[PDB]
């Protein structure tokens, strides 16, 4: 309860990124997470689009790897209050980015789940699949989080 | 060469002005040629504060690392197109897509001003492979990258 | 009925369905929705070619990706257990490689060779399978990862 | 004499000397120390078959691997400047495949299709080589990293 | 339980005292079992002052990553071996070879003890797949390793 | 001249190791390396004969990685004291190392060849490729090298 409340604010509320790529948290549990992107400014007639969306890709695909890492970590942080959980989300940093590309984003919506493999002591593996509006599998990813 | 100067200027045009990303992370070319291209960054919100500043900084270095190998590839692959006129060239640009983004990360960036330089290690038919490396202010090494660029 | 009609639908699609039959046997000894297993033999063993380990290392290649199919195909239609048999069948044809990664250990040019594959994880659209294949007298000759997507 | 029986005894061994032929046809394009290319024509469509798009996957990799044994083939045989055609005829018999990884972008189940190899460096046991696989229509549909040895 | 204990004593043997590297790099077994495995390190001769020293701890680092996915490997087989006696089992130990390391180093070692974890994420028939986390006195992440052992 | 002198002295005199296993700088230049190694104790029937050979292998190709890369960045430091560029090889540290066994070990001596494929600004990639006394290919190695 509080949980979802805690990571909504931080995820769609607090990211000033916002007025140009849309965010919001639809599925979030120990093992899986889902989020749901916009492009607010579909890039249209823009000479590199395709090279842009490249970049948003790897982006969504590292927030949704990093909400995962923070439910995977969470999950260990048994008797711990609230706080000391929503402080650690502020340690979480990228090691590792893998991602492969499977066709060109070029849409308005798309969708990315992240999946925790395995969550060890300090590293946790999340492999994403990205999708557009037509579930379309147009990337996927193993990222790896620490907590630093 | 009068070739170079319209490559640079169309260039500059494309990734400093053209890109609407420009008045959050401001984007700036520092070096071109066919084996080697060199980007700078500058984060106008370095996000002091943010539950998920780390977080959002890995975006920002995979961004910055995809955009330096696109322009690197670019680079490489209009060197091929030896006797095409200067509108093909900037033409092909709009074909650039990538296939494969593997990005390694050192230390997080937590810097407002940071520098990627693109290496192109080798340039097939239709497949540009890059190697680059990302620092900050201090030119201390933060994240190294390997991308793959194809023609759509 | 169903758990039957699967074993049997599979058997000849994979044993003989396939043309290249002729050249390479494939039979298909045990399947389940986390582990499958294949055994292959050589009709052709290529004694007197000068590129015959060149041959061999795309015989292997052919041969992991196969199994990694069967294996991606048993982990999807586990997902589908509301659905009919006849929905899980022309499920199969979506099936496409995405990314085959293989190992070689030893050059094992045997007659008879079998190949094992786990479904490591299943996604909504991704199947990872880690393959291992081995020789007559059990050594392991190859490892492989493979990727499977629902095209 | 020596660059022409080159070509002569390399394309006897890949196009006419491969059993394989009457499924997958192969032709050698050009050769080169540097970069190889294979031209390949499916003898058998397979229309009809229900994993047509997995039997691609192992054909795919097999013509992967085959290029970059050319590629390798034409790096090590570049290093042996004072031996004589016998010898590097004898060589191609030890190149065998260390590791293969293939990409898959599209599905590209045509007739014909090619493949390029780039020898990206050959040290003194290893040669890595780089493939990219196209269709009918010049599209990219895989990508290939490929090490061989002499074994 | 009576096969766990001859297990644990067993292993205990071979990797605390018969290992001849040990009278450099000292080595204690913290915890095993069919899934997880947890191995301690000693540096006894820091090297400070040696003009390679960042180096030499390269090495070191591979080798305890190696060691620990070695021991990890060993108790994913084992497991498999149900009903066989204690002699086979051990017997086994000296079969396992690697076949792959792969290791990411987050920052250079420079500390006197060091502790690494081996995670067993999968032991088909032949292959044992290990994932490690190695970490140092001050309980910071300093290397990471992918690990595959085969029975040769 | 002073360099070969230098070089030999850190690596073949100066490494502690030198009591367990020998090791020989045979080859230096800026694209190649060549270091050879002596195992003073053969360890025949240790019960982890051949994963303690993982390990020793590991850490050779690390070394021969390591000579590569202080080889590569010392060269691009032209007009620079044979004083500053000894002080560099104390700032290389290994931020990436991938090795791959073809067959066991268990030799008395093994040579490991190291090839600098590409030398960046701050990473120095390295390709090596370690034989026994037979001249057979046991591994191979991919290692990166960075200036800390």
Not at 34 to 42: A, G, N, P, V
Not at 109 to 116: D, K, L, P, R
Not at 134 to 147: C, F, K, N, R, T
């Amino acid at each position: 309860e509080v949980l979802f409340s805690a990571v909504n604010e931080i995820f769609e509320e607090k990211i000033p990124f916002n007025k140009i790529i849309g965010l919001k948290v639809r599925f979030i549990s120990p093992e899986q997470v889902k989020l749901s992107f916009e492009m607010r400014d579909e890039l249209i007639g823009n000479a590199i689009r395709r090279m842009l969306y490249g970049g948003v890709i790897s982006s969504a695909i590292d927030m949704t790897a990093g909400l995962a890492a923070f439910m995977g970590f969470q999950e260990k942080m048994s008797g711990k209050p609230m706080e000391e959980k929503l402080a650690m989300i502020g340690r979480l940093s990228t090691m590792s980015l893998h991602v492969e590309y499977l066709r060109p984003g070029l849409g308005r919506e798309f969708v990315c789940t992240g999946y925790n493999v395995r969550t060890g002591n300090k590293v946790a593996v999340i492999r994403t699949e990205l999708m557009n509006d037509q579930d379309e599998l147009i990337a996927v990813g193993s990222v790896s989080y620490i907590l630093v």
